[PDB]
Nucleic acid binder design. Structure first.
Ligand code: ADP
Ligand code: ADP
Lengths: 398, 392, 169
DNA sequence: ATATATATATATA
DNA sequence: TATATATATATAT
């Protein structure tokens, strides 16, 4: 296994944010909202890496839409790019306002991996997203999502996020524990990964080959459900603990359908499925529907990224069974209601700010995506090419 | 290599855009905004060749939308033709107001090429386009686009702009470093480029030779990726450095410099639907795969349509040029937000960068047929190129 | 023939005609005479494009995309400003449009791509939309009676026999 | 009290 | 079916 020292290590941050600067910014926000119609008093300050949440208590008898309908003007009168108004804070009467700082600290990916969450995270598919608005990291199990949608316009830090997720997979799991399928219609980003032992296929370029790979994944899901029926288990981890119990007693439990092995966790990533549904058509959308409908228990998981949030790409069928959404900076509030099904995705800053939406109804966790460099990615790729051979299958492309 | 003096020389340096005249304009703007409900205060003044930016400082309480929803009346009462309100200036607390200036000045192309951004440039295929709001030039780079759709109607800026791009190819590079392929089912516009040493074929008249040229380009893409998989090379300039090190050593190479290829089409609208939609898969495979090979596309059409500019061509080309399609309604076919709303026909354009954001305000620098024909004859003094019959 | 002669428009080829026997120096046939400017008037292309189909629209689009520097022009007249007649094919290629009194703003957006055509006072009072600037220029129509038409037809029939290319049909 | 902004309702590409 | 336009309604003036 690769160590945690291949990365560029933890840097020294420019933490010069004094309490007198916080008091000055608090009084400045009080004045600049008093100059408009509202009147508000700053309650407390949460300083952070990239943004700085202010908990402001409104006056007696002033609404919150009269704060949300001038977020642009409050951002203009403070010499910042854009402010974000959190309309509800769980457990308090205060309204949140998050102002970007000046010395925007780059989130160090080695600081994200150095957490007590990620270090003893037992699951074979973790995701180190990055630090949230208050400094601590957010590590999310990819098994429990079970799938993922990523969006945001170009240059808003999206391939960096997908590379952070794939390196989050690579620093924990062997090719006997996890396994990947990659699709790339734009060979700049994902072609750096061709050679790692966690692959089943060459990095898929054409869309007919990608349709063949997704039909192979349907067939693999169906035969895994039939094999779990033939062994009488319920989920994938139950089958892996069943064959582990066969390993513990030294007892060979043979093939129920003709010796079994620990089936690794397939993860199917897609760089741009908008091009896929635009080239091939509605049957690819129904194929992703038939994947997302059932493959939670079989251990086949989806990472979907797109650059075109619309009704044509992010449809009802894709939003049917993929409830976990990553949204970077997008253009309109209509696109925010397209992916996150609510406003608020447009207020971000670029450079990998995402609104993590967990599975289930909740306020979106604003997580700053950790920057990963081409040198670190290339070093992980070369370490796995020096510690692993490819495991290809011819049938996945035909 | 022709000098920059074969262009027409720099025109009359128009003075009398004085600080007292712009101060009178700024006080006029303060008075005309004070007559309505708002109160404004001009902070600084950014002049320019075509238009002028006024960084105004709004007072306490006045919103931006109050300024934006009377812009028609403000542009009426300033004796100007239009106005635009830049709602955000990064890092400053000031709203930008864009006012068209008095003399709609033409951008001189020698004023574009004389800047050190073009002269000390490092790549081989730049596209000098024009200036900003303040007159500082914007010299882009075609190697990072990596493909460039041009579309528009009504004879707006298109053929002059494509000539400016191809001259930006001409003035820097040699044919050994950057070749060209030209395709035009119109026999008219780009026929003046016949005989220049940067080409590879005649200016294509029979569209079956255009399909065979694109077929040769696809096979060239295939053999260049076979070359790079035989050499372990990501993008073309790495192999150019490797063959430079093999040329310093005289080292021959195996059979699995390479010329940079830029293919233009001016009327693929009727061509792609009459010759066959099999052309579109060729164009999409080139624009997908050959973005690291060196085969770049300056695609141009006279009819920007949903039929001929589909999503299949929108996929691999995120760097777009649109002058006048009809309006901001059918704009989303090529420029995804909005098009000919304040593009003044012959001139200003919207350059969509390889990233995104507010796209670049680019004034289309003028080129004339004397300059075009003179650069063509100056390169025809350097020689006639190689012509491949398999392309034809 | 203009690609053979290296000519950049029609007016350049009439300048080649001025280089020909107009200035007293005859040419060859690669003696090329004048190529006359053709103004093809169509009184009702709605009937044509609803009866015979869309291949006529393919022909009209291949003309209207290209024929400025050619020597063939079209005055298209109709009575249905609708998508059933005027599609987007014959929209972006004819940027100069005459709009008389129509009965809806929808038809005004169908032809002029804006509003204000149904407001006209009738009887030839049109909205000349010039090329380039997409702003309407309102023009009152000039009345010419049928007797003046018979006079001009008589004045041309008393001067020249019909010079036909009869094989057009 | 009433011009403005806006959410929705019907007609069309 | 997505959208451009049109009409009735809070809203703060
Ligand atoms: N966490 C981060 N810190 C700093 N910069 C970032 C971060 N994430 C992304 N970026 C910047 O954003 C850019 C990534 O854009 P990207 O989303 O890959 O474009 P596209 O959507 O076209 O693939 C990079 O150039 C990088 O500089
Ligand atoms: N910088 C400029 N200044 C003034 N006019 C320009 C400039 N650039 C282009 N033009 C005008 O553009 C016209 C040519 O349009 P063109 O590019 O041929 O459109 P199309 O190719 O659609 O016919 C010329 O009349 C020329 O005057």
């Amino acid at each position: 296994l690769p160590p945690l020292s291949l990365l560029d290590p933890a840097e020294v941050k420019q933490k010069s944010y004094s309490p007198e600067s916080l008091e000055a910014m608090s009084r400045l926000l009080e004045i600049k909202l008093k100059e408009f119609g509202v009147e508000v008093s700053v309650d407390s300050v949460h300083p952070g890496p990239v943004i700085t949440r202010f908990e402001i208590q409104p006056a007696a008898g002033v609404k919150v839409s009269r704060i949300s309908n001038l977020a642009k003007d409050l951002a203009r009168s403070l010499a910042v790019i854009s402010v974000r108004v959190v309309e509800v804070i769980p457990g308090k009467t205060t309204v949140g306002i998050e102002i970007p700082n000046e010395d925007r600290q780059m989130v160090r990916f080695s600081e994200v991996l150095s957490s007590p969450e990620y270090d003893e995270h037992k699951s074979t598919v973790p995701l180190a997203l990055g630090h949230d608005i208050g400094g601590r990291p957010i590590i999310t199990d990819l098994a429990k999502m079970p799938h993922l949608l990523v969006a945001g316009t170009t240059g808003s830090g999206k391939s960096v996020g997908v590379n952070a997720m794939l390196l989050s997979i690579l620093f924990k799991s062997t090719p006997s524990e996890a396994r990947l399928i990659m699709i790339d219609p734009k060979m700049l980003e994902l072609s750096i990964y061709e050679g790692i032992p966690h692959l089943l296929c060459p990095v898929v370029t054409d869309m007919k080959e990608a349709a063949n790979a997704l039909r192979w994944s349907v067939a693999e899901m169906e035969r895994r459900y039939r094999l779990m029926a033939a062994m009488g288990v319920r989920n994938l981890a139950g089958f892996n603990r069943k064959v582990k119990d066969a390993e513990e007693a030294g007892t060979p439990l043979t093939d129920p359908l003709f010796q079994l092995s620990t089936l690794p966790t397939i993860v199917v990533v897609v760089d741009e499925f908008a091009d896929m549904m635009m080239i091939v058509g509605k049957k690819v959308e129904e194929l992703i529907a038939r994947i997302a409908q059932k493959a939670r228990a079989a251990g086949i998981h989806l990472i979907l990224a797109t650059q075109r949030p619309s009704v044509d790409v992010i449809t009802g069928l894709i939003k049917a069974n993929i409830p976990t959404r990553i949204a970077f900076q997008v253009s309109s509030k209509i696109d925010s209601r397209t992916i996150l099904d609510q406003g608020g995705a447009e207020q971000l800053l670029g450079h990998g700010d995402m609104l993590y939406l967990p599975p289930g109804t909740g306020l979106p966790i604003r997580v700053h995506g950790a920057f990963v460099s081409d040198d670190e990615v290339h070093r992980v790729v070369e370490a796995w090419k020096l510690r692993g051979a490819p495991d290809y299958i011819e049938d996945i492309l035909a």
